[PDB]
Amino acid sequence: FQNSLLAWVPCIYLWVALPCYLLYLRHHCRGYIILSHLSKLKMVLGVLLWCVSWADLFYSFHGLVHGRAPAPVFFVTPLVVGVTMLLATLLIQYERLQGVQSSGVLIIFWFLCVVCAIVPFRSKILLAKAEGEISDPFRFTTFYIHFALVLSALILACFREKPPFFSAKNVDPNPYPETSAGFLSRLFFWWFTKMAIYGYRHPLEEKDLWSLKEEDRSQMVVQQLLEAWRKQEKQTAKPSFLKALLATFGSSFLISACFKLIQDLLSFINPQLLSILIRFISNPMAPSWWGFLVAGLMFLCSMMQSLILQHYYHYIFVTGVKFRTGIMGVIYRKALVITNSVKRASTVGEIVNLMSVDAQRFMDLAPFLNLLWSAPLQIILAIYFLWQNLGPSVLAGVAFMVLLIPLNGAVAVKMRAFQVKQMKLKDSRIKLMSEILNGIKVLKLYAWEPSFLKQVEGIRQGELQLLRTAAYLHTTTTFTWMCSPFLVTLITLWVYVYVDPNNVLDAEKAFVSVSLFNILRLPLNMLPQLISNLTQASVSLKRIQQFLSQEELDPQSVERKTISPGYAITIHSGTFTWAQDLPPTLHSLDIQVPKGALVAVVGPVGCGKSSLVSALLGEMEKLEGKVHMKGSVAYVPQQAWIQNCTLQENVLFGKALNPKRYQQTLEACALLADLEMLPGGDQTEIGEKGINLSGGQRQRVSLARAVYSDADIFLLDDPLSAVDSHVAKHIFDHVIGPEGVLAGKTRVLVTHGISFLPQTDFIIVLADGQVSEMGPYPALLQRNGSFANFLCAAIGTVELSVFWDYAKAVGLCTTLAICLLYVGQSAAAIGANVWLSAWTNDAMADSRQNNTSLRLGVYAALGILQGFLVMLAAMAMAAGGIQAARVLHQALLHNKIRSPQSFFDTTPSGRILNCFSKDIYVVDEVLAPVILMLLNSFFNAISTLVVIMASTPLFTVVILPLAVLYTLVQRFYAATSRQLKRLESVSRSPIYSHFSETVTGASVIRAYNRSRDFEIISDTKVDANQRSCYPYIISNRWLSIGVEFVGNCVVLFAALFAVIGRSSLNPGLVGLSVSYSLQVTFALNWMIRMMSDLESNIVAVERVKEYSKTETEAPWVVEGSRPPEGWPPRGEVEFRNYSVRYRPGLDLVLRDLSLHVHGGEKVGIVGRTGAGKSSMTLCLFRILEAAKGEIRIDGLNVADIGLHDLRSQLTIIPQDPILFSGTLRMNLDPFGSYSEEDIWWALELSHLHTFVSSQPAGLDFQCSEGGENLSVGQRQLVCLARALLRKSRILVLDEATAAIDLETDNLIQATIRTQFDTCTVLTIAHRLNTIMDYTRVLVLDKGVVAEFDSPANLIAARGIFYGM
């Protein structure tokens, strides 16, 4: 005791000197000593010294067994000469990061640590040898390893360091504020706060993110991996990615394993301190401060167990990001230059899957990776204390929980083989959705739509019944985190009681053990996640091996240093092949091109043209020969390559933008016509990111880029293949030809054209990969050989009401039945724990233990309920969630079918497919589990808080300020991290957009020697994602610190209010209070983890419910207002001053229509170009609502008739008739309303009987999407049959001569003539052949009636009808 005190001298010295040292460390402006190997090891002695200042402590705690609870001096000295070492190894780090080299204060610290250890050193030696032997070897070795460590640390701190050499001024913008951050301010992540403020008063945009720090800018971490991967090769004086990946990410992973080790060896302090508190709180002779001290250093040892952890995550997420960046960078570097053969063999859509998956799950593996050893050290240690505590019974408990690793992975393999192996129902349903969406027109003019509604409802209900048992087996992840704690504690206590009835249960056993099971159970449920992620990353690593071990394409295929005089391109009898094994396509080909000479290449289709130019660039492995060039080149691939950026970039292509040259190239290529058409000018987006440019324009822009690149040797490749002929002549005239700009440029042209030949200079004739004839066309025309044969708030948190909406979609008899039922379960759980307390403090007084068999019993029947009242809840939540989907999905679908055609016109059919794809997916199987786990976490927190309050009644005083602080931190997080999540989720996809673009364009990326220039772009596009995935990680950490002080300032108060009322209560209550206050910082991150996994997901319900009540304005059927049955046979059409327009506030297309055709008569409509005759058709079916004027049919107004009855009676043949995938029975009669014989009879008349009879499926002939397996004409025949079945008195035609051939036009006109003599006929067409024969014809012009009479009367009037 005269020396245990003496060891306190250096600790108190360093502690008191610390606040008078950080005010001088900041008096050094900036030194930034480089990380030498001395300072890298001056802080490894200290951490190891803490780890031997641990056994110097837990030896003291071993007195708990054998009875002797240690005196405070006997267990605080190792606990505080252990904390300072985590501060010695931290002033070592923070000093080096400042200018100081000779530490001064810290060398004194180590010196005193040595000096105060001299006296026991000068004493323990003499007492040992003289009196015998070991004499308590544990305190001996823990001392003499401490002495060696401190001596070595002093010696190493006696050395000098390098001069600061620091820097000049770095850069102006907001720099990453971890550099230039004081000691106390970087320990607690206080520097991030500036954004936590700015992330709440304003929104965040890319201009205001942390300008990323220099070490990891994705071009300094790729290099750190390329160097390792290169140096890790065969090395004779085979290679594996894993070795390089370790050698380049081992420095940042054995410095993030020290933190995990420190944390999980610092975590086993609190259960033992709790044991000390419980077993002093019973003692009435122990002075008061022996409990106050334990509470104090149960706080100051739990605001440090979770500060070397929330500071762990900062160092193993910012290495997950470095995995995700090094992998992507090296893969991109490879994919630029491998081979065209390897691309052809593999899939261009698969290479990109080497990011966003299959190489990003390395970012998802980093946090789980250290679990590999931290699980077998959180167990073989937490088993030890438990065994020490309850005895062998503990095994059973842990055994059960270990047993819960497979049966929590068995569902993870039943599910994931029950929701993706059978989600093809979703695939087929979304296919049917896409089919229904486009072509909705003909689907809606006739009443086919509700049959499709029935079809999709049936497939949906099939997809949901397979989703019932796809979520019940998810209520086994609400059985691990809400019902397993009680089960494991019960089984432990059960085996403990049954094995031998002589062992009582007291507070310091039961409650320490149930507070230690907590510590063991977090890294024993994320362990199955480890198995899953590691076993699906062990294949990703193999795949990245497969990609990186692919042959490059530079065996110096071309040399660009020497050339024959006056020549630009020459090849010496070379041979080329598209694959290293396949027969060479080219055999000993020889061409000598003079400078500036245009050369054309000829042949038939399949002689080897396109494989000539591809060989010149160096993408065709030459078996023999030497290919030469001199100067830059420009390549125009046949499948022209369009960059996924703006037109200015996609034409300038990394050059200097000169408006004079730029504009003249654009006009010479004849692309200004598109520019005047372009909606935004020459800045329009291109590619999948922009307007999908058709084939014609892509070659124009490619050729323009080539010519503006003004390289020496243009290697063209039939760019005029997919363009209009006349402009193509100008394209050759103004650009390629000698009159054009490129007279002095060595052009090489390969094309199938003929007319361009005479204007060329030289021509090369290709046959089976061999040259036959060379020379000018007028000279070659003398030969006339086989070549002659070639000739012929808007932004913010969601409103509260939407939550209610979701409840109204679950039934609202289930919402009460689930909220009330969790309230019941929480009451049961608190009852179980209170009963355990009243058992454990009962066992100490009662002389009779015979009563135990009751308490145990009821404990079971009071916690088993808490299982049976949670599972029976979680199912009735999942079995509500799918219900919540069902109705909700219906309420969307049944409205989108009922929307006006203008809704589908103003929309590109992409947004209305976003829903039914994702926004219906989130409410389908992403929202129900999240809300279930939120509702588990909230009630876990409630049960914990109420048990703490109940056990120590006066603790309620502080429960408000903790609540306000925690809510403040939660709100600040939910602002700033929401901003960052949005800003990062939208900036990552440009990486994969820039990829999937170099892969296709690797041919044209090279030959512009732009490969290096084109990977810096990938570096900056992943940099613009790193600079918003870093501050999100740090924001998460700053939150978790804020929610951790308010989860440790409650352990402090639980212990303190336990010790302040010692005279009142009995030990069974403080044990419960403290042991359930130790996990009020786990059920307080879980309740935020979910409350932000539901704020970013219940946006989906708002959107889905918003897509409703969208002005359907179309009642399918009416109440009793149906027109009289047998309605068509009257068949009279009559108008009264009709006028209509597409949209409100739109120029009238129809005006004052007053037309009438009698019953059974035939009539057509003709309109001049621009009259707007098409709309008339839709006006008959009430597609456009009658603006002014009632279209009366048979003396009845159609505006008061149900469409499903109104449209059924009429008969339409649409302008663009379409088939729908499925049988023919569906494609002619979904309602099954007609006899098959007449169907076949109509099919016979449809000129299709030979086709249907030739197929045994016939009526069941499975049509492709739109009947693509049939020809166009056959599709109009099928739709002609479609109209044939209905056979009503009213017939109307839509564009009988729109674009069909004259052959089928004759057939359709004849079919119209033969059967439809009696029935009323209306007609619209581009050709008067079917109209001139009508009894009466109306002529529509600019939306008014002009000529409504017989064609003979029209002939006399000589209008537009008779004009031509």
Ligand SMILES: C[C@]12CC[C@H](OS(=O)(=O)O)CC1=CC[C@@H]1[C@@H]2CC[C@]2(C)C(=O)CC[C@@H]12
């Ligand atoms: C902590 C993290 C990592 C990242 C997420 O945590 S979050 O607070 O940053 O969202 C999810 C997750 C939960 C449990 C964590 C885990 C990574 C590995 C951990 C730290 C262990 O060995 C014990 C606890 C495990």
Ligand SMILES: C[C@]12CC[C@H](OS(=O)(=O)O)CC1=CC[C@@H]1[C@@H]2CC[C@]2(C)C(=O)CC[C@@H]12
């Ligand atoms: C909450 C979550 C993640 C979601 C899981 O539920 S699931 O339905 O998503 O599988 C439960 C799960 C396990 C451990 C949880 C973790 C989220 C973050 C937590 C709370 C910490 O910082 C410590 C423990 C971590």
